Design an enzyme around this catalytic site. Sequence first.
Site, mmCIF file in Angstrom:
data_model
loop_
_atom_site.group_PDB
_atom_site.id
_atom_site.type_symbol
_atom_site.label_atom_id
_atom_site.label_comp_id
_atom_site.label_asym_id
_atom_site.label_seq_id
_atom_site.Cartn_x
_atom_site.Cartn_y
_atom_site.Cartn_z
ATOM 1 N N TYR A 292 -18.964 2.820 35.598
ATOM 2 C CA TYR A 292 -17.549 2.863 35.941
ATOM 3 C C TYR A 292 -16.960 4.228 35.589
ATOM 4 C CZ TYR A 292 -12.501 2.201 35.457
ATOM 5 O OH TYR A 292 -11.143 2.348 35.510
ATOM 6 N N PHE B 205 -15.144 -8.785 20.416
ATOM 7 C CA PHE B 205 -16.542 -8.426 20.584
ATOM 8 C C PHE B 205 -17.002 -7.560 19.419
ATOM 9 C CE2 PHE B 205 -15.019 -9.511 24.837
ATOM 10 C CZ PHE B 205 -15.907 -10.518 25.148
#
Lengths: 311, 310
Positions: free
Chosen positions: B146, B206
């Site tokens: 990305y 996370f």
Amino acid sequence: MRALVTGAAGFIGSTLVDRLLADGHSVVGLDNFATGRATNLEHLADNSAHVFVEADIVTADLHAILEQHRPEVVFHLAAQIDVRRSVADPQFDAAVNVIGTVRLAEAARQTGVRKIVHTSSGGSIYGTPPEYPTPETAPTDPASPYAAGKVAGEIYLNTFRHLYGLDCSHIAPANVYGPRQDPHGEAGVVAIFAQALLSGKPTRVFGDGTNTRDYVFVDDVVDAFVRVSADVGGGLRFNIGTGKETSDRQLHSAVAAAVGGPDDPEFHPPRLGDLKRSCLDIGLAERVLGWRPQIELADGVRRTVEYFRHK
Amino acid sequence: MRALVTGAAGFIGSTLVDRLLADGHSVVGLDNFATGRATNLEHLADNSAHVFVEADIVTADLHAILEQHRPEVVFHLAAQIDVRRSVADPQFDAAVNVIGTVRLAEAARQTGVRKIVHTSSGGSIYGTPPEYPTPETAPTDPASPYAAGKVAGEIYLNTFRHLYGLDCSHIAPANVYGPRQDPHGEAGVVAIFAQALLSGKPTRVFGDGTNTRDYVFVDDVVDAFVRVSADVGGGLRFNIGTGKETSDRQLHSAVAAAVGGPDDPEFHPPRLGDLKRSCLDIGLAERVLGWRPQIELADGVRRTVEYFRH
Ligand SMILES: NC(=O)c1ccc[n+]([C@@H]2O[C@H](COP(=O)([O-])OP(=O)(O)OC[C@H]3O[C@@H](n4cnc5c(N)ncnc54)[C@H](O)[C@@H]3O)[C@@H](O)[C@H]2O)c1
Ligand SMILES: NC(=O)c1ccc[n+]([C@@H]2O[C@H](COP(=O)([O-])OP(=O)(O)OC[C@H]3O[C@@H](n4cnc5c(N)ncnc54)[C@H](O)[C@@H]3O)[C@@H](O)[C@H]2O)c1
Ligand SMILES: O=c1ccn([C@@H]2O[C@H](COP(=O)(O)OP(=O)(O)O[C@H]3O[C@H](CO)[C@@H](O)[C@H](O)[C@H]3O)[C@@H](O)[C@H]2O)c(=O)[nH]1
Ligand SMILES: O=c1ccn([C@@H]2O[C@H](COP(=O)(O)OP(=O)(O)O[C@H]3O[C@H](CO)[C@H](O)[C@H](O)[C@H]3O)[C@@H](O)[C@H]2O)c(=O)[nH]1
């Protein structure tokens, strides 16, 4: 090693295949013959150390191919190579040069490949830098879609290096010439001049003919590919050139003398996408890889012009 | 001005459409609804100054679209936006973010467009940078596909500027949040937290929850787009953020406090492709454009929570 060379039916690619085979490696060649030629590889037909796969890097199942052949190093030379074509169809150029590279990297990271050696364009990626000869530390400033796609390819491979530890180095040649360069191609001035002058056909120079490039012999470039294929220069680009400048008019004179006829080119308007000056600092390649070009332009043109007379 | 906004059915895109309309411009919105929603634009059903075109930037005849509408500025917000998705399928991400951009530029240079305002990723393009907060002078070092595609898009547009004088600037936001951000996915943490905590549904951080991002409110980002649309900052990137780091854990606490009730997120394994820290130096945008963020995180979080409530 097990090696795979994309663009293997092409000028530099077929030369690289030969060298790798001479060095005792097994070599898978891959090409779709967009610009390549069967005659570049025809001598290898009975060499069991060489296998050829016809594949388009944009659409082929590269995962399956790399899973089958299990290369340690992929030498990535498959590309749309024509700057003018990149301007005419930037999408096509980006599809081959960016998407194709991405697909190859994605395949390689899954199939146990150690390293991808990318082919960038030292001659075009820097645009018009303030430094000549231009070091790798100079920022990229592409002025053609071709050049942009080459930079994009480097960046994607650097990304895969971060992500997966898939090693990569970027061989960034200047202007490469020598045996097997297509004489009928739209690019490759040394080949174009030779073909036209030997046929006695009109030759052309663009602008005033002062535009300059750095001319490096194919064998020297091939050696750089070999040296960089080891565990070295991770995420690094290496300029591969001579660090000497030759103008369009100068080059014409150098080829015209080699043919031994008239030195009278026509003057045509500048081509959109083309840079005016190009010259690479090759110091990094010397320090890191121990690479130096062996062939001076005079010697190189001599070996080239005599290749074309036999054909 | 005649404006065209790619990604107009999206979070930032729909917000930008509203601002451009409020400023008295005509707007062509373009989207394929990959991640956008018609509901983001449904309030404009009877707005006489917006027209919508459903098109895929990768495959549609962009030349024909731009020829008909003749936008002066194209605000390019259409993209694959999920970092993990880019890791799962780098080819698709590159097709949308690189090929899509190239096709748009090639169409724009032929159709009298003055300027493309690109959307880069200030939050990700620098990878692990030399310093935080990170100025635009720091080298790009993308560590997800990305991020790589965003860098490549910048470079391509810069190339079209050289070739044709098609002007461009690169708006490079940090982590954008606010109303209309989709809460049902894996990206857009503020929205994810807001909707889940309002619904009493599980939330997660996370790794160890220490990842930082620079959270900038959507209205501020939109303002930067408008400012840079003029003849200013040609070929330049502008970091658009706050220059303040907030950890995943800290953000969860902020959202939980605004919603009320528990502040007890689950902990999940780290996500490959995600950087550990992100923080932008916004000095350039202040000097050149006169742009500054107005909305502090606490205020922004409240407004976001209220959108999701109603
Ligand atoms: N020749 C130069 O002066 C020079 C300088 C710098 C960079 N390069 C790079 O060196 C590499 C080799 O170029 P070359 O001079 O040998 O040109 P070439 O045209 O002889 O070789 C390129 C090869 O790539 C193949 N190819 C193209 N698209 C393909 C696709 N989609 N799938 C599979 N194969 C495909 C072609 O068929 C061809 O055989 C290219 O990456 C080029 O950009 C060349
Ligand atoms: N949200 C952030 O934190 C942030 C910050 C930096 C960069 N950006 C960039 O901002 C832009 C907008 O992102 P967002 O947060 O609004 O997400 P979003 O998903 O809401 O918006 C993206 C829009 O692009 C559209 N789109 C995707 N592929 C398309 C295609 N092929 N053709 C046409 N339209 C297509 C989607 O349908 C969607 O409406 C993107 O370029 C994104 O990369 C976002
Ligand atoms: O349920 C969740 C989702 C995310 N996070 C954390 O929130 C942060 C932000 O993650 P996410 O919302 O997925 O955004 P990013 O991956 O940082 O990327 C966003 O911000 C970038 C700019 O930094 C833009 O370029 C991207 O388009 C946009 O998706 C990270 O530290 C995540 O660990 C959580 O803790 N819980
Ligand atoms: O008939 C011709 C053709 C070319 N030239 C001049 O020769 C030089 C070299 O032009 P080429 O087309 O041979 O090569 P490029 O400099 O355009 O190089 C590009 O095309 C190459 C393909 O051979 C590589 O892909 C390389 O990376 C890319 O930058 C230019 O200054 C050009 O003006 C002439 O004078 N006459």
